[PDB]
Each structure stands twice: as C-alpha cells, then as structure tokens.
DNA sequence: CGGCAGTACTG
DNA sequence: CAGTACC
DNA sequence: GCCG
C-alpha cells in the first residue's frame, strides 16, 4: 500500500541496524511496519502523525517522500554500510565484529577469510554463508522435525517435540527450525542432550555446532540425498511447567512477542519464555518486585490471564 | 528523562 | 564482563 | 527513532 515510502525507509534501518544504532533502527522498524498494516495511502503530515509508530521526524521524511519522490538522507548513508551488511551476515558476527574488521580494512568476504581471526562460530557462518541466507520449504522443515522427533522418542517414547518458529506459524518457507522437547512426567527432559545429539551426529544430520548449552542446542543439520543445503537447527528442552510460555515465546514472531511484553507491563506483570508473572514492581523498570509464577499449562491461559483473546499461531506472524 | 525484555552461551 | 543470538 |  505505501512500498513507495517503506522501501526507503528499509534502507535507512538497514543502515543504522548495521551500524549499530539499535534503538533508532527499532523505531525506524516499528514505523515500517505500521506503513504496511495500514488502511490507505498516506496523505498527510497529519495523517502521518495519525499513525502510532509515526512520529515528527518520521512524519517530515513521509512528507519529503511525498512531495519530491525519494529521501535527501538516503544519499549520505556512509559507504561502509554494504560492507558492514555483509560482515554481519556471518553467524556469530555483530555489529562491534563488523566494525572492527572495517576499521581493519577488511572489505570482503575472501579478506575476512584470508586475514581474519575467527571464533569457531564465525568460521561455521563463514562456511555456511550462503547456505543460512536462504529459507527452506516448510515441508523441509517437517522432515528435519520428524527427524529430531525420532531420534528422542527412541530414548523415551514419552518425549514431546513440537517445531515452533515461523513453521508453526503456518508460513510456506521457514528460515530454520526451532524444536521444542519436553515431557509430562516433569522430570524425563534432563539430561536428554548427550544422547540425543550424538545420535543425530551418528547419522551424519547434524554437521556442526554452534551452542552446546545445558537447555539449548543451536547447529547445523543436513538431510540425506542430492541437492540439499545446510540448515540451521535450534533444540530446545523445558520443563513441562514452562511448556505453554516457551511454545509461545518460540513461536513469536518477535514483534508479537514484543507486544504481549508490553500489554503484560500495562497490567504489572512479566511475560518470558519460562513464565508469565503477576505483581511485578516498576519504579517503568522492573525495581521492587519479581513477583509470583501464574499457573499456564495452556497458551490459552497465557492470553485468558493477559484479557486477551486467544490468537492461534498463524495470526501471530506480525 | 529514559524504557523500548530476558535469557542463555562463548571466551 | 562484552558480544551475540533466540522469538 | 517513538512515546509516556
Ligand atoms: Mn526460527
Ligand atoms: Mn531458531
Ligand atoms: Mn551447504
Ligand atoms: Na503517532
Ligand atoms: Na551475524
Ligand atoms: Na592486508
């Protein structure tokens, strides 16, 4: 509806994103994406101004836009803002890395892999570099769940294993998979790791690591035959108390997540992916009270004690 | 003025 | 700890 | 960057 205006305000997040400016970029974001959900064209500094997440200064550059056809900041982005892009595009590379290796006077991948240090996860990104750039269909997706799935009912058939990610959310392309475990019995979940991932390195699946935590695995996976890419895989194990925050959380999308927080602090509570919790003490930051764990076997409860109207997963994907 | 989320890893 | 990543 |  307005992609004459979004586009070139994407450019401008790109840039502060990669720079650094994380705040601004999320304002530029959150404002970006306002533009899409909206009813008509904008038309008006004061329509501009209409709309939550539109601003003064984001309503000026609407306005500019507007009037001439493009944006007088766009053309002093500094140059090494594609280059800063590219770096950051490597898994376990941020901003500070990119900097850094700027300010270096590395400027392409082939300097970064000929002259850089790099931490054993950036050397997996680099590897990988075009591999996690590209999404998998969610058909893909289900095959790498099953086999996830299959790996860890064979060591109890009690296990429960949900992918969560845009995948639950019903999207066509996915661009990972994010794999939930844990068990009713509330105690069969611990320990699970060891075994599972070696037995999915037995089968070749997995192909590296990147975080081998207590709770949390992040790696890359692989399925067998001909044309197939290297795909990132997140697992994730809870108790089953934490079931209903973690599939939620899990499933997102972020910025649905960010909108429940902020509904959640509206109301003196807390909202994570372990727990929703009530009596929360905000002096607006959290000072004299973590509060009390509410009971959430359900995300429906998760909603039910937000007085919220439950939303399944597919009307989630904001 | 200052939050805009917390949580877990890595080294 | 700073940096990075997860939704 | 926005917003209270
Ligand atoms: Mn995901
Ligand atoms: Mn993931
Ligand atoms: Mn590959
Ligand atoms: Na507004
Ligand atoms: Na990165
Ligand atoms: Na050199």
């Given at each position: ?35 899409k959900?909206?009813?008509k ?8 101004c209409?709309?939550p997440?539109?601003?003064?200064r984001?309503?000026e ?12 900041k ?16 490597i ?13 270096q ?44 799935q ?9 296990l429960?294993?949900v ?16 794999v ?11 320990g ?16 590296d690591?990147l975080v ?7 790696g890359?996976?692989r ?5 197939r ?5 997140d697992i ?32 003196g ?28 076997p ?21």
């Amino acid at each position: 509806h307005n992609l004459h205006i979004t586009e070139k305000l994407e450019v401008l997040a790109k840039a502060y994103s990669v720079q650094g400016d994380k705040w601004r970029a999320l304002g530029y974001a959150k404002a970006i994406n306002a533009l899409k959900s909206f009813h008509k064209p904008v038309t008006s500094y004061q329509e501009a101004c209409s709309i939550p997440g539109i601003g003064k200064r984001m309503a000026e550059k609407i306005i500019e836009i507007l009037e001439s056809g493009h944006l007088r900041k766009l053309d002093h982005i500094s140059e090494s803002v594609p280059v800063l892009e590219l770096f950051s595009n490597i898994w376990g590379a941020g901003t500070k890395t990119a900097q850094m290796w700027y300010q270096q006077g590395f400027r392409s991948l082939e300097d970064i892999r000929s002259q850089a240090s790099l931490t054993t996860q950036q050397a997996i990104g680099l590897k990988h570099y075009s591999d996690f750039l590209e999404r998998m269909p969610r058909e893909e997706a289900t095959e790498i769940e099953q086999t996830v799935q299959k790996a860890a009912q064979a060591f109890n058939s009690g296990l429960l294993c949900v992918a969560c990610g845009s995948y639950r959310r019903g999207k066509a392309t996915c661009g990972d998979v994010d794999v939930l475990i844990t068990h009713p019995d509330g105690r069969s979940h611990r320990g699970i790791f060891s075994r599972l991932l070696d037995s999915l390195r037995q089968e070749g699946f997995l192909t590296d690591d990147l975080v081998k935590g207590e709770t949390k695995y992040l790696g890359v996976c692989r399925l067998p035959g001909p044309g197939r890419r290297h795909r990132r895989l997140d697992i994730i194990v809870v108790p089953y108390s934490e079931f209903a925050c973690a599939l939620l959380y899990f499933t997102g999308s972020a910025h649905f997540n960010r909108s429940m927080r902020a509904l959640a602090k509206t109301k003196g509570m807390s909202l994570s992916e372990h727990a929703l919790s009530t009596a929360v003490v905000r002096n607006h930051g959290a000072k004299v009270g973590p509060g009390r764990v509410l009971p959430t076997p359900t995300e429906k409860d998760v909603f039910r004690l937000l007085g919220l109207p439950y939303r399944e997963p597919a009307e989630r994907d904001w």
